[PDB]
Amino acid sequence: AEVRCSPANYAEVRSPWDVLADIRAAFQECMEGARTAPGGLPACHVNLILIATRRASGDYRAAIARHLALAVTAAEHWRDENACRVVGVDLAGYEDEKTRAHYFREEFTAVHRCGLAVTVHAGENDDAEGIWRAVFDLNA
Amino acid sequence: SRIAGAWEMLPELPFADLATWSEGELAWLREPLDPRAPADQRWVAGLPKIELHCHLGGFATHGELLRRVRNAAENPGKLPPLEEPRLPEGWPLPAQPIPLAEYMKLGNANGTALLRDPGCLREQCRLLYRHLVDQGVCYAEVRCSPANYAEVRSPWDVLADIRAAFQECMEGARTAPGGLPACHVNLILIATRRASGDYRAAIARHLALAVTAAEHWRDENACRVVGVDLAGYEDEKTRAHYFREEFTAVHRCGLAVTVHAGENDDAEGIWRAVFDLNARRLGHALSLGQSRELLRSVADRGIGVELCPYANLQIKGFRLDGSAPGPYPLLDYLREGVRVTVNTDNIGISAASLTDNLLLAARLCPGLTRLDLLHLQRHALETAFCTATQRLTLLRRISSGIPRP
Amino acid sequence: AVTAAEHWRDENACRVVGVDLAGYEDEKTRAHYFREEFTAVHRCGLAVTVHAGENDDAEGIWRAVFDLNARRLGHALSLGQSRELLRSVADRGIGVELCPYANLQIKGFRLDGSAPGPYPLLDYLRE
Amino acid sequence: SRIAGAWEMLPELPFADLATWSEGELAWLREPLDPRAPADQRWVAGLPKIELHCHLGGFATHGELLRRVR
Ligand SMILES: Nc1ncnc2c1ncn2[C@@H]1O[C@H](COP(=O)(O)OP(=O)(O)OP(=O)(O)O)[C@@H](O)[C@H]1O
Ligand SMILES: [Mg+2]
Numbered sequence A: 001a002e003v004r005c006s007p008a009n010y011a012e013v014r015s016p017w018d019v020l021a022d023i024r025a026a027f028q029e030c031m032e033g034a035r036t037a038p039g040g041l042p043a044c045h046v047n048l049i050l051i052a053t054r055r056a057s058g059d060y061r062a063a064i065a066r067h068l069a070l071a072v073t074a075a076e077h078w079r080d081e082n083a084c085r086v087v088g089v090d091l092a093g094y095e096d097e098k099t100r101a102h103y104f105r106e107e108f109t110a111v112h113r114c115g116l117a118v119t120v121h122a123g124e125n126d127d128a129e130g131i132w133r134a135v136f137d138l139n140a
Numbered sequence B: 001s002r003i004a005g006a007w008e009m010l011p012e013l014p015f016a017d018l019a020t021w022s023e024g025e026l027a028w029l030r031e032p033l034d035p036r037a038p039a040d041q042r043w044v045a046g047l048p049k050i051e052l053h054c055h056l057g058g059f060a061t062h063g064e065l066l067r068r069v070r071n072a073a074e075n076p077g078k079l080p081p082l083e084e085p086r087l088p089e090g091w092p093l094p095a096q097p098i099p100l101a102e103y104m105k106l107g108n109a110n111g112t113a114l115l116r117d118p119g120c121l122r123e124q125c126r127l128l129y130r131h132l133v134d135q136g137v138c139y140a141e142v143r144c145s146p147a148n149y150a151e152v153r154s155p156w157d158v159l160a161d162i163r164a165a166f167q168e169c170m171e172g173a174r175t176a177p178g179g180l181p182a183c184h185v186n187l188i189l190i191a192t193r194r195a196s197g198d199y200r201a202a203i204a205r206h207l208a209l210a211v212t213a214a215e216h217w218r219d220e221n222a223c224r225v226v227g228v229d230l231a232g233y234e235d236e237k238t239r240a241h242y243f244r245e246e247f248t249a250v251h252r253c254g255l256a257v258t259v260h261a262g263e264n265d266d267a268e269g270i271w272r273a274v275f276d277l278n279a280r281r282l283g284h285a286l287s288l289g290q291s292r293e294l295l296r297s298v299a300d301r302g303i304g305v306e307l308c309p310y311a312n313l314q315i316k317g318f319r320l321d322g323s324a325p326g327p328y329p330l331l332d333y334l335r336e337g338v339r340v341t342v343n344t345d346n347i348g349i350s351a352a353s354l355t356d357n358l359l360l361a362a363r364l365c366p367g368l369t370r371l372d373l374l375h376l377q378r379h380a381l382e383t384a385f386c387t388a389t390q391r392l393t394l395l396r397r398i399s400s401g402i403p404r405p
Numbered sequence C: 001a002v003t004a005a006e007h008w009r010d011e012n013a014c015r016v017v018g019v020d021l022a023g024y025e026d027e028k029t030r031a032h033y034f035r036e037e038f039t040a041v042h043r044c045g046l047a048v049t050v051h052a053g054e055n056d057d058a059e060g061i062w063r064a065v066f067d068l069n070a071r072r073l074g075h076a077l078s079l080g081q082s083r084e085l086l087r088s089v090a091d092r093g094i095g096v097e098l099c100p101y102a103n104l105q106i107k108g109f110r111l112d113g114s115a116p117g118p119y120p121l122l123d124y125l126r127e
Numbered sequence D: 001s002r003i004a005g006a007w008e009m010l011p012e013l014p015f016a017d018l019a020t021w022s023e024g025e026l027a028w029l030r031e032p033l034d035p036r037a038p039a040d041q042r043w044v045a046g047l048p049k050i051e052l053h054c055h056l057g058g059f060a061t062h063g064e065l066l067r068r069v070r
């Protein structure tokens, strides 16, 4: 399973990095607790995907930049193959003509440079043009 | 009576305690500095300083410090062979300007080849903090590249270890009034750009690490990552405005940005850094004088300029004691009102400290006065990235810590 | 504005010292749509001021601050919504101009401490 | 004597020249403003002010100023 989380929304006195570390630590300890299945492997393997959520109005671009930077740092931090890792980023939230994928290329350039998987919410409330922008302008 | 006599011309003065110094000492402080006089050297050494341009990777590059850095590794067997890169004749004051690539190569004994081991990194941090406190620095900002020091530990681990070492160093030396550290050290991450190879991914990783580190540690009385840098090779095809998309996320986060521009580039690179990358400080803006409008804009926008005199003389070459690279731009920058500071750049490879930097800044431009040195200190105090309360505390400490002649 | 700034240079005399970006604003008329026009003004080295925040979120203020290079912001009432943008405006020293009567009449605020929200003058002084 | 008394709070003061005020006068400059008091209105009127946002086209729109311009 790949669970998506937004640790920056859970930071009021502890950093979003601390929230992400706590989430991954809980997942890893619960993994090590359930050592069923053959070969000494965890019963269910879960990886993390950071959520970059977009709103109709307000302040959300700083949140997107913070999530992307946190995802890059977390991916570079934990590299153990047999452990919970951050494997990609997300582009979710409200969608219309004015919040399509191609408006978010510049901050996703860093994620693409780092070599991190990208997934996008598209087609829920948009025609095929939004899916095209997500596929070919953001490289989801 | 001292305050009453010098109550006029107070706002032109750089600090508050300057007024309480008598007409004789004010007249002495307005005379041009004489670096040959031992009294002037002692006064400059005793002056409390603020450091803004210091590279962590260029401290232990020559001399016994290397041994003190070499005899601290966890696994000495992995250490590369001890090689000291030879220096040309008269290294502190070379007769001929020297290029930049060999300049980088000169610090090959330290950095990636040596700081990859954590014990060497911790000892380097401790030695650098001891050197800074010995020089009298009340506030310094150190540039580091943690991602270059990772093989099994993440660059986040390197940054955490560096900040922990600096924090323990600050906590250990709890001198000075108010129970505050003798020197307060912050961190700035460097985004290096090369002529060819893979560097943009490293730049993006450094920017993400800087944003995460800034969001993690928020204690004002603690070492924090307070900005990012864009250093390395620069030319027409490696200008600042090629890196807008990488840096916009940093601008989303609200992090200070410093830029290397003008070392071997015209004023176009400086303009690109100022108006397209939004640099709050410009490093080595030697070519700013060609454009008058850009100089006026940098003056009125309050954008700081960091000049290291030893590095500028070693790289570009300059005429000493008023005897064609052009005159050193300290004096006209000061007269035009731009916020100008004097720093060390790489302490080790230049083999000099802040006191030598200020003395040679006086040497390069005859007519410089000690009031100009205090003005440079005030400019460094204002231009550094710090909280307002920290700025007031630093101002009070520097005002109350200037020695009498 | 560029020609007038180049024409009159007497410091002890009336001069044109900056340009403005005023008028109706919305999602389709942000500051980032005027970057190519204002590139010449930035090249000539002239001050720039913008109206932002009166009837829009902090994104317009961010655009006015960061890709239009504004030195002052006009009616930045929504700047409290963005903590990071507020810190950037504070450390960059960008001036923020507030007109109490215009803000009271246009947006409407509560007087004598009696939902537009509170007037951010005290908060802006605090930060 | 006044300036030596209030020397240590000089950076807090926006203007250095008001550091030569009384301790009572400075305490009068620290509590919240009273717009209803005529004395406060007179003091605010007498204060020197700097203006940065004034539209020339919206100055004389009503009153006698419109007729005098016309
Ligand atoms: N004056 C300067 N002008 C331009 N670039 C500089 C200057 N001084 C240092 N640099 C570059 O900035 C980098 C910052 O130093 P850093 O500590 O990250 O590297 P290092 O440990 O010396 O290793 P390496 O140089 O091999 O990457 C230096 O490596 C050098 O490449
Ligand atoms: Mg190096």
Ligand SMILES: [Zn+2]
Pocket (backbone or CB within 6 Å): B053, B055, B143, B231, B260, B283, B345
């Ligand atoms: Zn540098």
